[PDB]
């Protein structure tokens, strides 16, 4: 073949995105 | 303190006198005074090429500066932190402290003495790996625009850095 | 047949009866530094080691004196 969704989406979205294996080393 | 250190005479008693000024400032309970005295003393160790207590005492200064107010004071110790990590030839931590100084000094209008030094050191950090000479040439060009007509040695070394990069 | 191994094992019993645990412990003084180490490298390290055991063992401290004399 704001700042509440910008801070919330910021730290909850882009901070885990720009680092690898954080899902493993943050207490998943 | 600046006019006493710029004379460059009897540098042995200068660091001990600065330690007595920090001891006195702690005796009179002046936090910002001893923070400035350590902010200049770490520059004295930077000129003395003593990177152990400069990075250690500078880190202990960061532990009490990141929590407190006056984020503009952190630009000097993070900029000089990039200067001592560059002196120790450390690219990732100098880029991390550089980015922290950018996101810290992004809202505060810094004077051209400190604003142009960010790009001046940035051009040397990017020029250390030889990734792209155009962006580094822009950092030295803006650094020359910042150091223009403010200091003759800084201007001749600014154009020296332009002709270098 | 496998029956001829008995007198050879009797010779091994005589060799073991010569010294009672003397080569196991005396040689174990070096085997404790040789245990778990690759024995393939111990042939070269033991070759040059036993080769230099007589004289000029290290010889690296003597080069500083042999520079001006040779």
């Amino acid at each position: 073949p704001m700042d509440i969704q910008k801070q919330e989406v910021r730290e909850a979205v882009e901070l885990p995105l720009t680092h690898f294996e954080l899902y493993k080393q943050i207490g998943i | 303190l600046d006019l006493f250190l710029d004379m460059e005479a009897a540098t042995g008693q200068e660091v001990e006198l600065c330690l007595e000024c920090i001891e006195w400032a702690k005796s009179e309970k002046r936090t910002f005074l001893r923070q400035a005295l350590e902010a200049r003393l770490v520059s004295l160790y930077f000129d003395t090429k003593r990177y152990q207590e400069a990075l250690h005492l500078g880190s202990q200064l960061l532990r009490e500066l990141k929590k407190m107010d006056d984020k503009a004071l952190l630009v000097e110790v993070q900029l000089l932190e990039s200067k001592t990590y560059h002196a120790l030839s450390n690219l990732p931590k100098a880029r991390a402290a550089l980015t922290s100084a950018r996101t810290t000094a992004n809202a505060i209008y810094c004077p051209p003495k400190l604003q142009a030094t960010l790009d001046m050191q940035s051009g040397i950090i990017h020029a250390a790996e030889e990734k792209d000479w155009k962006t580094a040439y822009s950092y030295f060009y803006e650094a020359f625009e910042g150091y223009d007509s403010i200091d003759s040695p800084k201007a001749i070394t600014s154009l020296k850095y332009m002709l270098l990069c | 047949m496998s029956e001829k191994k008995q007198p050879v094992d009797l010779g091994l019993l005589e060799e073991d009866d010569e010294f009672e645990e003397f080569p196991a412990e005396d040689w174990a003084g070096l085997d404790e530094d040789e245990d778990a180490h690759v024995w393939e490298d111990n042939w070269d390290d033991d070759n040059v080691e036993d080769d230099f055991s007589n004289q000029l063992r290290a010889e690296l401290e003597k080069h500083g004196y042999k520079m001006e004399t040779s």
């Binding site: 294996e21 493993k24 | 450390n90 | 778990a36 690759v38 070269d44 040059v48 690296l60 520079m67 040779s70």
Partner: protein
């Protein structure tokens, strides 16, 4: 244990063999004997110590304080027993096992770490107990006892690599891989030095760098150094501590033997008189000499005795027997000739020998398929 008594009691190697440095080691050993219940270690190593005049003075106090703290940990263990709880009994038996590691007796600490090893509610604390057996296994220099609990505790982690747990286990891997002569697989262990820190339990950071600079400096070639350490900023940070290491790195990478041989005596003397690094001093010297001779001889086909003698700064009478022993013993390059008194090699090791590297596996595989014929009918 994790106390400084591991290092203070670890200086017994340089306390034992040489009689010159046996003054400071017995100075801080006797001064530190009143710490961490050092009675039994130095009493066992008393034959390598002074007389019995001052020895029997403190034994009466240490033997009663040992029984006092021991019976207090027994009473605390009985107070923790017969009660609902898991971490309390683990801390009581674990603390008793830590004191039994302070006295230096692995019988009651063996059965103690066996009981608290059986009371492990999770695998992380189990690996912590394993490390508690490794910290004393370094002093006991055992081979299999420290690899059994790590071979069993290695698999089934499932909790991810921590900041100091997995890094500490990697440090132990560097330890037992420095003990063994395995280098091509130990060159990957010290790559996590970014997250390493001053660990007073086993080895200081400067001692970890000082210990890995040998396996990295010798066990690696020029592309491996340029990729790993020269590109990395870690050695660029830690070179300012001691100016000698920078000389042994820039002089070796720069191929300057005139200063490397004058300064090599510090590597010779420092190489010995160490706990775990002394018995291997013969391999690093020869391996480094043949590695340097293969480094210079790689890019050089023919070599006169003048440029060689001036480059190495040694007489021709010594390099004569050097290369003479390294033709058959070393087996680095083809046969050498002296018809013109000039080192001249050919090295046809690429064109035909690159295809001839598989004939060894062809003959061993031939005997192995002869074994396959031996399996036939029986």
């Amino acid at each position: 244990p994790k106390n400084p008594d591991l290092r203070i009691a670890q200086l017994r190697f340089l306390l034992s063999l040489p009689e010159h440095r046996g003054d400071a080691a017995v100075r801080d050993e006797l001064m530190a004997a009143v710490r961490d219940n050092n009675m039994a270690p130095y009493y066992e190593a008393l034959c390598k110590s002074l007389d019995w005049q001052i020895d029997v003075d403190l034994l009466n106090k240490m033997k009663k304080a040992n029984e006092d703290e021991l019976k207090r940990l027994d009473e605390e263990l009985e107070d923790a027993e017969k009660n609902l709880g898991e971490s309390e009994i683990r801390d009581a038996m674990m603390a008793k096992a830590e004191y039994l590691c302070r006295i230096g007796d692995k019988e009651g600490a063996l059965t103690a770490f066996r009981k608290t090893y059986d009371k492990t509610v999770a695998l992380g604390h189990r690996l912590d107990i394993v490390f508690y057996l490794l910290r004393i296994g370094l002093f006991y220099m055992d081979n299999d006892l420290i690899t059994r609990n790590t071979e069993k505790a290695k698999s089934l982690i499932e909790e991810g690599g921590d900041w100091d747990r997995r890094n500490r286990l990697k440090v132990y891997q560097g330890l037992y891989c420095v003990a063994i002569r395995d280098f091509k697989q130990a060159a990957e262990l010290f790559l996590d030095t970014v997250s390493t820190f001053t660990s007073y339990e086993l080895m200081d950071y400067k001692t970890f760098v000082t210990y890995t600079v040998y396996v990295s400096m010798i066990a690696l070639e020029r592309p491996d150094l340029r990729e790993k350490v020269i590109k990395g900023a870690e050695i660029l940070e830690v070179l300012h501590s001691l100016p000698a290491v920078r000389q042994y790195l820039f002089s070796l990478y720069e191929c300057r033997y005139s200063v490397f041989f004058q300064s090599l005596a510090v590597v010779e003397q420092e190489m010995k008189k160490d706990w775990l690094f002394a018995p291997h001093y013969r391999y690093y010297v020869r391996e480094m000499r043949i590695h340097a001779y293969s480094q210079l001889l790689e890019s050089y086909r023919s070599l006169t005795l003048g440029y060689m003698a001036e480059a190495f700064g040694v007489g021709v009478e010594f390099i004569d027997q050097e290369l003479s022993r390294f033709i058959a013993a070393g087996r680095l390059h083809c046969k050498i000739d002296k018809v013109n008194e000039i080192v001249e090699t050919n090295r046809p090791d690429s064109k035909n020998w690159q295809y001839q590297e598989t004939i060894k596996k062809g003959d061993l595989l031939l005997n192995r398929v002869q074994k396959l014929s031996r399996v036939i009918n029986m």
